[PDB]
Amino acid sequence: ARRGALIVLEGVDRAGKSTQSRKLVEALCAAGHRAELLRFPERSTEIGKLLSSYLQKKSDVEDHSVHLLFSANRWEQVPLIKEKLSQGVTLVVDRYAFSGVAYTGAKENFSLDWCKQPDVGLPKPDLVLFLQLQLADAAKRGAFGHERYENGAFQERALRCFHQLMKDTTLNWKMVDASKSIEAVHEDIRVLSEDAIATATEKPLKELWK
Amino acid sequence: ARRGALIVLEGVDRAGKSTQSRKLVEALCAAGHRAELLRFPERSTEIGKLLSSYLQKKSDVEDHSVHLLFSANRWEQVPLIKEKLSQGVTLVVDRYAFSGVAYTGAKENFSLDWCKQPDVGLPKPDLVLFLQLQLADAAKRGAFGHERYENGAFQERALRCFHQLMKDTTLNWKMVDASKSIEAVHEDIRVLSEDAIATATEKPLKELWK
Ligand SMILES: Nc1ncnc2c1ncn2[C@@H]1O[C@H](COP(=O)(O)OP(=O)(O)O)[C@@H](O)[C@H]1O
């Protein structure tokens, strides 16, 4: 069975990741592919509720612990992800390990190396779209929500970390100009996605950061 | 303020860790030290209940996720541990990161390196007592409980991992002959502990595996 592609959407807050993830799954299915949507954090599981509570500022969680929970929340969906991809379903994922390193990496005294480790070995994405746009334009998209990390200084430090993670060519990173219109951004991501789906069927699923 | 020592007790199942941890805290306090007992997993927290449920076989948890939860369960007590040690309290801990690597490391395809990473940076123990005894003698101590990992093959593979972790001299490992009587083993551990308490007051608390 021809495997599906693992596609990840990354980017700062308000970059359009959730809107484009949804629209990408709808377009791929309308085009005859079997595609499904996933997101991280996956807030429906027991670890997911601890995470959701933390982000809603309803609870405080020690920073290394919260980093590890974000990773475990990915490992708990790995058996499903592998199962689906091997069945031929392409998965479109709104945030993944990159967000996990970039957001904890924005906290002082958290090295990029330490942050990466828990995620070493996850399914390696076939494509990582980075939805680029000036944090200034992003701010034009209404106001900041009330969740943890939803402020300018934190976003700025996470973008810097994302810039470090892009210097790793082992991954198929693709920059997307997220400043355009929802439909324009969508057309770009769809075209990149169709190309990746075609090629993923040729090489086995690899492991991240290893 | 003269800091307290961080003492860890490690060893296989039924080696006497809980009995000796308790008795060690009682003896140190009777001898005029301020000492308190801790254990891992710490089953009282939200992560702790997920862990307890897993070990009671009431739930199944994906292996990398469960490994990370075991680590987070340590990081969530780090602010307390540091606070207490700096106040002059010696902490006696029944299991720590070593058990975290040795038990996950007993599962196929989990490298010692990957297992260590989440715990990199924890408070470094001043003393790590390893309660040594033949798995055969341990089995004489009644029967195996009904928790996960409580079987011969798994214990055997964890002991091998513990043997690897002892090859790291960066840590103050001390072997204890756990085959003796409860009081005899106790006298050995107490004497080693008093010596470590005296010296911890001279050097700052270090970080584990880094
Ligand atoms: N290309 C775009 N242009 C203008 N507004 C956009 C665009 N993409 C998304 N939006 C709006 O910006 C807000 C954030 O979009 P969303 O997809 O939720 O971003 P993310 O998931 O990156 O936080 C939403 O109100 C959305 O409608």
Ligand SMILES: Nc1ncnc2c1ncn2[C@@H]1O[C@H](COP(=O)(O)OP(=O)(O)O)[C@@H](O)[C@H]1O
């Ligand atoms: N030195 C010893 N000799 C004989 N029995 C012992 C000794 N130490 C502990 N025991 C008994 O063995 C069992 C396991 O001891 P415990 O301290 O709970 O071990 P652990 O916490 O390593 O599993 C308990 O019933 C305990 O009373």
Ligand SMILES: Cc1cn([C@H]2C[C@H](N=[N+]=[N-])[C@@H](COP(=O)(O)O)O2)c(=O)[nH]c1=O
């Ligand atoms: C997947 C993931 C998300 N995050 C963050 C990014 C987001 N905060 N901001 N900005 C937050 C919520 O994600 P969404 O914006 O996709 O709902 O979780 C982490 O901190 N670690 C992780 O592993």
Ligand SMILES: Cc1cn([C@H]2C[C@H](N=[N+]=[N-])[C@@H](COP(=O)(O)O)O2)c(=O)[nH]c1=O
């Ligand atoms: C602290 C710790 C314990 N463990 C295990 C060792 C034990 N199973 N066995 N044998 C189990 C319960 O610990 P106690 O035996 O101390 O109750 O948790 C891990 O698997 N990872 C960890 O990080």
Ligand SMILES: [Mg+2]
């Ligand atoms: Mg979103």
Ligand SMILES: [Mg+2]
């Ligand atoms: Mg015990």
Ligand SMILES: [Mg+2]
């Ligand atoms: Mg390394």
